[PDB]
C-alpha cells in the first residue's frame, strides 16, 4: 500500500447519489473553502493576548463543468426545484483514494448559478454550493 | 570514481583509452557570480609583513556566492540507474556533504541519447549537476588609522 | 514570560545585552568513531536571573 | 566555520515535536510576518516630532504543504482537536543552521485552513498559524 | 575632477558607525522618501490662489538586505533593544562620492521589520526606518 | 516653413532663467496637466440640461531628471530655500519650436520631491511643480 | 498521466510509402532508494544560572 | 600584460606569433550611448582665437554616458583561475581603478570551450567585460551676446 502518485482517476465525488463526470480542464475543478477563519488573536495595549475560537463549521464548494455534462443537467434540475419552492439537502461528498483526503456534508444547497455563454468555443459552467456543516476526513495514509 | 555510485569517473578532455564499458565523465560547462554585489569584505593582516613604516600589510578578500555548472555523462548498460541513484542521493543528509563552503543545489533533467558507435548502439545518459559556493581571494590594500578635523565659526 | 529570566538589559549600564543564548555544537566535524555511540554532543544555555526586593529605603528630607 | 552557501537542506523546522517535511515548490514555503508595525512617527503642525513604540510582540506564520505530507495530517488532526473544544499551544520553531537566523514561539494556534482543490494536478495547501509572542534568534554567524 | 560614471562602488552608507554591505540585487536597494508633500495650492471659487507650505521635515528610508549580511545582524539586535524598552537614535547617513548627492539624519528609529521567508532560494529582507529630521546635502559637483 | 518632423532637439524649457538639460529616457519627460475639469453638465429628472464652467485656471507640471543634472541641483537648492522660509515664484515656461505648442506660467512652487534611490543603476528623479495660473500658447503653425 | 498529440509521418522506405504514427506517453511514479545513515538515541543538557 | 593577473595580454587582431602557452586576448565587440539625451553641454572659448570680429570662438561639447563591451579570452592551463581572480577583483576598491571617467560595470558569465588544436585539447576560457564612461568631443558653434525688444500698445 505505497503512497502512489496523484491522479484524477482515483478522486471520486458523489452529488446526491450520482457521480460527477464532466469537469473542465485546469488545476482546480472542485474546490472547497471554509466559511470563516478558525480563530482570532487579540493583543491589548499592554502586551497580553487572548485567542478566540469560532463555532462556525461551514463550507462552500465550487464545481466547474463542461456545457455538456449529466451533472449539469442534474444541477439545473435541482435549481428549478429550489426555485419552485421545494427545499432539501442533496448531500455531497468527495474523497481521494490515494490518501483518504477529502470531506463530506449532509445537507447542501445551491447558492450560485452559472452564466450561459455561447461564443465560438466551449466555456466553463461554475456552480457554487454551500453547507451548514462540513466534516473533513483525516488523511490516514499520509 | 565517485563514492555514491560504484563506478569509475574521469575528467572531461584527456587523451587516454576509454576505461571500461560502464563509466562516467564530468566536464565544467561554466560558472558565474550569483549576486550583483558583495556580502562582506574580510580584512586580515599578513603574518610578519612590513610596508616600510612599521605597519603590517593588510589583505582584503570579497565574499560572494557563485554557481558552477557541470555536465555529467554515463556510458554503458547501467547509466539510467546510476544517475537515478545520484538524483535521489541529493535529498538525504550526511550523504551529500562537500568539504568547504560547497553545496549541491540541483540535479537537472536526465536524458537518454543512444549512439551508434563501433557497430553497436552504445547506451548513454547525461544530466547537469550544479554546485554553489562562496568566493575566496585576496588583494593587498591600504587603510586609515588616524584622523584630523578643523572647525571654525565664520563670524563671531 | 513567567518572570524568571532578566529582561534583555545589562544592569551595569542599562544597555542592550541578550538575556538568554543557546549554543549548539556543530556535528560536521565529529568523527565516525564517536558517531557510532548514538549519544549527541552537549547543548549550552545561558541565563540571567531576575531579581526581587526584600528591603526598602526612604529618606524624607523636610525643609519647612 | 565559513559562511557556507544557502540551502534548504540546512533549514530545520519543528512543529510540536515532529518535523516539517512536505513543502511545496517556490521561493517562499515558510514565511513569518510580524503582527503590527514597530512604531509610528507623529509630526505636528509646528515641525516637532514624537515617536511611539508598540508593545505588540506577536507574529503569524504561513506554511505551504503538498497534498501528501505527514505534516498535513498532523495539522488536520490539530484543527479537529481545536474544533472539538480542546485548546493548547503546540510550540513551533524554525532556524537556519548556516547563520542561526530564525525564531521560536511557545504557544501557537491554528488560525486559517487550506482549501481542498482536486483539479487535474497537485495544488498547495496553505496553513496560517498565529502566536501571542515570537522571539527571533540573533544571527550570530552573520 | 570630471563627473565620472555612476557606480555602486562609490556610494557609501553608514548606520550607527558601521557600514552597510549586504544589499540585494536591483535598481533600488536604498530608497529614501519624504514624509509629506512640500506644499498645497488652494484655488477658490473666484480664481484667486493661495499656496501653503508645511513644516514637516521628516523622511523614511527602506533598505533591502540579503539573508546573510552583518547589517541584518545589527538591525535585528537594534530591534530587540527597542522591544526591550531602550530607545535611542542610531544616526544613519548615506552619500554618493561622484556628485555629493544624498543626505543625513541625526536620530532614526526602526519602524518596520522583515518577513522571514525560507523557501527554496534566498529572499530579500526589507527594513524601514524613520527620522524626525532629514537634511539632504546639496550636490555641488552637479 | 514646412511643418517639420517632431524632435526633442527643438523643444525648449526654461526654469527661472536657466535651461533644463538632464532628462530621463521615455515618451514622457515633461508633462503638464490642468487643475480640474473645464466644466460639468447637469441633467435633471425631466431631460433639461445646464452646463457649468469653472474659473480654476491652474496647472501642475512633472519633470523627470537624471540623478546627475544641473537642473536637479537648482531644484534641490530651491526646495531648501522654501523649507527655510523664503517663498517666491521662479517662473517656468516651455515650448516647441516646430508648432509653437506649449505654455508659460508666472509664479510656480515646488509641490513634490523625489525619492533618493541608489540601487545598482541610475533611477529617475521626479519633481512636481504647481502654478496658480497657466497660459498655454496657441499653436499657430498647426 | 497523459497521452499526447498523435502525428502521422508516412515515409518512403523500400520503394513504398510506409504508413507510420507516433505519440508521447508519460507515466508518473514515486522514487525508491536507500542509503545507510546514522541516528541519535540519547541526549545531554546543561543548565546554569549565571548570577544567583 | 595586466597588472591584476600575472600574464601577458595582447590586442585582438594582430599578425604575430602566439606569445606563450598561457596568455590573454581582448577584443572590442561594440559600444553605444546609454541614455537617449545629453546630460550637459560644455561651452568653452578657444585659447587665442578670432572669428573675424574680435570674438574668441566658442567650442561646445556634449556629455553623455557610454557603454563599451569587450571580449576576453584566456588560452592555456590556467584560464579559469586567472579569470576568477578578475571577477573577484572587480569588487574590492583601490584595485579596480581606471584613469579618466571610466568605471568597470560588470563581468559576465565565464564559459569553458576546450578546442582540439594542433593534436591536443587546448584549454580555453572566455567572458565579457563591460566598461562605462562619459563622452568627450568638441564642435565650433555660435553664441548670442545681445538682445533687442520692441513693445507697443495697439490702441491707446
The DSSP code sequence of A98-132 is TTTEEEE-S-EEE--------SSS---EEEEEEES
> Which residues in chain F are closer than 8 Å to E39, comparing Cβ atoms?
82, 109-111, 130
Measured in angstroms, the CA of H26 and the nearest CA of chain E are apart by 22
Q: Write the Ramachandran bin of F80: left for phi over 0, alpha for psi from -120 to 50, otherwise beta.
A: alpha
> Which residues in chain H are closer than 8 Å to E2, comparing Cβ atoms?
100-101, 134
CA torsion through residues F110, F111, F116, F120, sign:
negative
* Binary contact (B94, G33; C-beta < 8 A): no
Grid-cell match 529582561, residue found: C7
Question: E106: exposed, middle or buried (C-beta count within 10 Å: 0-12, 13-18, 19+)?
Answer: middle
C-alpha–C-alpha distance, residues G32 and G29, integer Å? 10
- Residue D138 is classified by DSSP as P
- Residue D10 is classified by DSSP as G
Cell output for B5: 555510485
Q: How many CB atoms lie within 10 A of CB D6?
A: 24
C-alpha–C-alpha distance, residues E35 and C5, integer Å? 40
Between strands B9-11 and B23-33, the pairing is: parallel
Cell output for H139: 564642435
C-alpha–C-alpha distance, residues A105 and A89, integer Å? 9
Cross-strand partners of D136: D103
Between strands A18-19 and H58-63, the pairing is: unpaired
* SS3 category, E77: helix
Chains A and B touch (3+ CB pairs under 8 A): no
Question: F131: exposed, middle or buried (C-beta count within 10 Å: 0-12, 13-18, 19+)?
Answer: buried
> Which residues in chain E are closer than 8 Å to B36, comparing Cβ atoms?
25
Cβ contacts below 8 Å, chain B against chain D, sum to 30
Question: 27-66 in B: which are within 8 Å (CB) of D?
Answer: 39-40, 63, 65
3 state SS for chain F: CCCCCCCHHHEEEEECCEECCCCCCCCCCEEEEECCCCEEEEECCCCCEEEEECCCCCEEEEEEECCCCHHHHHHHHHHHHHHHCCCCCCCEEEEECCCCEEEECCCEEECCCCCEECCCCCCCEEEEEEECCCEEECCCCC
Q: Which residues contact C33 (CB under 8 A, 6 or more apart)?
A: none
C-alpha–C-alpha distance, residues E69 and E76, integer Å? 11
Between strands F49-53 and D125-131, the pairing is: unpaired
C-alpha–C-alpha distance, residues D39 and E31, integer Å? 19
Q: What is the dihedral of CA D9, D15, D20, D24, to 10 degrees?
A: -100
**Residue D107 near residue D130 (C-beta atoms within 8 A):** no
Q: Write the Ramachandran bin of A63: left for phi over 0, alpha for psi from -120 to 50, otherwise beta.
A: beta
Grid-cell match 544592569, residue found: C11
Distance of CA G33 to the CA centre of its chain: 12
Contacts within 8 Å (CB) and 24+ apart, D77-84: D77/A138, D78/D16, D78/D110, D79/A38, D79/D110, D79/D113, D80/A136, D80/A138, D82/A38, D82/A39, D82/A53, D82/D109, D82/D110, D83/A57
C-alpha–C-alpha distance, residues H37 and F13, integer Å? 15
Helices (H), D70-126: 70-84
Please choose, from the candidates A121, A95, A117, A127, the residue with its C-alpha nearest in 3D space to the C-alpha of residue A23.
Answer: A127
Chains that touch G (3 or more CB pairs under 8 A): A, B, C
Cross-strand partners of E19: E14
Measured in angstroms, the CA of F39 and the nearest CA of chain H are apart by 33
Which residue in chain A has the smallest CA separation from D120? A27
CA distances from B123 to B76, B77, B114, B120 (A): 5, 6, 5, 9
Chains that touch D (3 or more CB pairs under 8 A): A, B, C, E
C-alpha–C-alpha distance, residues D51 and D40, integer Å? 6
Cβ contacts below 8 Å, chain C against chain D, sum to 5
C-alpha–C-alpha distance, residues D21 and D30, integer Å? 12
C-alpha–C-alpha distance, residues D131 and D35, integer Å? 9
Name the residue facing G28 among A2, A3, A5 (closest C-beta): A5
Contacts within 8 Å (CB) and 24+ apart, H40-47: H40/E142, H40/F21, H40/F22, H40/F69, H40/F70, H41/F21, H43/H141, H43/H143, H44/H138, H46/H140
Q: Which residues of C touch E (CB under 8 A)?
A: 7-9, 14-16, 18
Cell output for B40: 562582506
* Binary contact (B141, H94; C-beta < 8 A): yes
Please choose, from the candidates E18, E22, H67, the residue with its C-alpha nearest in 3D space to the C-alpha of residue B35.
Answer: E22
Measured in angstroms, the CA of B4 and the nearest CA of chain G are apart by 9
Grid-cell match 546635502, residue found: E137
* Binary contact (F25, H40; C-beta < 8 A): no
**Residue E127 near residue E75 (C-beta atoms within 8 A):** yes
C-alpha–C-alpha distance, residues F61 and F129, integer Å? 5
Give, in degrees to the nearest 5, the angle at Cα B102 between B101 and B106: 145
Measured in angstroms, the CA of D98 and the nearest CA of chain A are apart by 31
* Binary contact (B141, H93; C-beta < 8 A): yes
- Residue A27 is classified by DSSP as S
* Binary contact (H103, E4; C-beta < 8 A): yes
Question: B58: exposed, middle or buried (C-beta count within 10 Å: 0-12, 13-18, 19+)?
Answer: middle
- Residue A26 is classified by DSSP as S
Q: How many CB atoms lie within 10 A of CB C35?
A: 15
Cell output for E130: 524613520
* Binary contact (G41, C35; C-beta < 8 A): no
H helices, E strands: number in chain H: 1, 11
* Binary contact (C16, E85; C-beta < 8 A): no
**Residue B110 near residue B62 (C-beta atoms within 8 A):** no
Please choose, from the candidates A1, A142, A136, A98, the residue with its C-alpha nearest in 3D space to the C-alpha of residue D73.
Answer: A142
C-alpha–C-alpha distance, residues C15 and B114, integer Å? 70
Question: 17-36 in G: which are within 8 Å (CB) of B?
Answer: 31, 33, 35
C-alpha–C-alpha distance, residues F104 and F82, integer Å? 22
Cβ contacts below 8 Å, chain C against chain E, sum to 18
C-alpha–C-alpha distance, residues F137 and A71, integer Å? 68
CA terminus-to-terminus distance, chain G: 67
Measured in angstroms, the CA of F3 and the nearest CA of chain E are apart by 37
* SS3 category, B36: coil
Residue E2 forms contact with H (CB below 8 Å): yes
Q: How would you label D17-43 residue by residue, b for 16+ Cβ within 10 Å and e otherwise?
A: eeebebbbeeeebbbbebbeebbebeb
Please choose, from the candidates H108, H59, H82, the residue with its C-alpha nearest in 3D space to the C-alpha of residue H7.
Answer: H82
C-alpha–C-alpha distance, residues G5 and G35, integer Å? 40
* SS3 category, E123: coil
Chains that touch H (3 or more CB pairs under 8 A): B, E, F
Question: 6-25 in A: which are within 8 Å (CB) of G?
Answer: 6-7
Q: Which residues contact H80 (CB under 8 A, 6 or more apart)?
A: B28, B31, H110, H112, H125
Q: Which residues contact F13 (CB under 8 A, 6 or more apart)?
A: F19, F20, F30, F92, F93, F94, F95
Kindly report the length of chain C.
64
Please choose, from the candidates B4, B44, B48, B46, the residue with its C-alpha nearest in 3D space to the C-alpha of residue B26.
Answer: B4
Name the residue facing H65 among E2, E5, E142 (closest C-beta): E5
CA distances from D83 to A105, D66, D92, D113 (A): 16, 23, 20, 12
Helices (H), chain B: 79-89
Residue B10 forms contact with H (CB below 8 Å): no
Grid-cell match 504543504, residue found: D65
Q: Which residues contact A53 (CB under 8 A, 6 or more apart)?
A: A38, A39, D82, D87
What is the number of alpha carbons within 13 Å of residue E79 lying toward its C-beta? 26
> Which residues in chain H are closer than 8 Å to B38, comparing Cβ atoms?
91
Residue D98 forms contact with C (CB below 8 Å): no
**Residue F108 near residue F46 (C-beta atoms within 8 A):** no
Cross-strand partners of C43: G45
Determine which helix (DSSP H) or strand (DSSP E) holds B63, and give its type and residue range. strand B58-63
**Residue D77 near residue D3 (C-beta atoms within 8 A):** no
**Residue A67 near residue A125 (C-beta atoms within 8 A):** yes
Cell output for A44: 491589548
- Residue E8 is classified by DSSP as G
Residue B96 forms contact with G (CB below 8 Å): no
Determine which helix (DSSP H) or strand (DSSP E) holds C35, and give its type and residue range. helix C32-35
Cell output for D81: 482537536
Measured in angstroms, the CA of F42 and the nearest CA of chain H are apart by 41
Q: How many CB atoms lie within 10 A of CB E57?
A: 19
Amino acid at each position: 500500500m505505497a503512497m502512489k502518485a496523484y491522479s484524477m482517476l482515483n478522486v471520486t465525488a458523489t452529488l446526491d447519489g450520482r457521480r460527477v463526470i464532466g469537469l473542465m480542464d485546469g488545476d482546480d475543478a472542485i474546490t472547497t473553502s471554509p466559511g470563516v477563519d478558525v480563530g482570532t488573536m487579540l493583543v491589548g495595549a499592554d502586551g497580553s493576548w487572548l485567542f478566540s475560537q469560532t463555532a462556525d463549521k461551514s463550507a462552500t464548494v465550487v464545481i466547474k463543468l463542461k456545457p455538456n455534462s449529466p451533472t449539469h443537467r442534474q444541477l439545473t434540475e435541482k435549481w428549478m426545484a429550489q426555485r419552485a419552492g421545494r427545499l432539501v439537502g442533496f448531500p455531497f461528498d468527495f474523497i481521494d483514494s490515494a490518501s483518504n483526503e477529502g470531506g463530506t456534508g449532509a445537507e447542501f444547497f445551491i447558492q450560485k448559478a452559472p452564466d450561459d455563454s455561447k461564443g465560438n468555443n466551449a466555456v466553463v459552467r461554475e456552480w457554487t454550493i454551500v453547507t451548514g456543516e462540513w466534516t473533513p476526513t483525516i488523511p490516514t495514509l499520509l | 570514481m565517485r563514492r555514491i555510485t560504484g563506478i569509475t569517473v574521469i575528467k572531461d578532455h584527456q587523451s587516454e583509452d576509454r576505461p571500461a564499458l560502464p563509466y562516467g565523465v564530468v566536464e565544467l560547462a561554466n560558472f558565474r557570480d550569483l549576486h550583483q554585489q558583495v556580502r562582506t569584505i574580510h580584512y586580515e593582516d599578513i603574518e610578519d609583513s612590513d610596508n616600510g613604516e612599521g605597519f603590517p600589510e593588510v589583505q582584503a578578500t570579497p565574499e560572494v556566492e557563485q554557481e558552477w555548472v557541470f555536465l555529467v555523462q554515463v556510458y554503458g548498460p547501467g547509466g539510467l540507474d546510476y544517475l537515478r541513484k545520484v538524483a535521489a542521493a541529493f535529498h538525504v543528509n550526511q550523504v551529500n556533504d562537500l568539504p568547504g563552503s560547497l553545496v549541491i543545489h540541483e540535479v537537472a533533467q536526465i536524458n537518454s541519447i543512444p549512439e551508434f558507435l563501433g557497430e553497436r548502439w552504445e547506451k548513454r545518459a547525461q544530466t547537469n549537476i550544479t554546485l554553489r559556493g562562496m568566493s575566496t581571494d585576496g588583494f593587498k590594500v591600504d587603510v586609515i588609522e588616524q584622523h584630523v578635523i578643523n572647525v571654525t565659526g565664520e563670524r563671531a | 514570560r513567567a518572570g524568571i529570566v532578566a529582561l534583555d538589559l545589562n544592569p551595569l549600564t542599562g544597555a542592550y545585552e541578550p538575556a538568554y543564548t543557546i549554543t549548539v555544537p556543530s556535528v560536521f566535524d565529529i568523527p565516525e568513531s564517536q558517531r557510532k555511540a548514538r549519544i549527541a554532543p552537549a547543548i549550552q544555555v545561558r541565563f540571567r536571573y531576575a531579581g526581587a526586593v526584600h528591603y526598602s529605603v526612604i529618606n524624607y528630607t523636610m525643609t519647612f
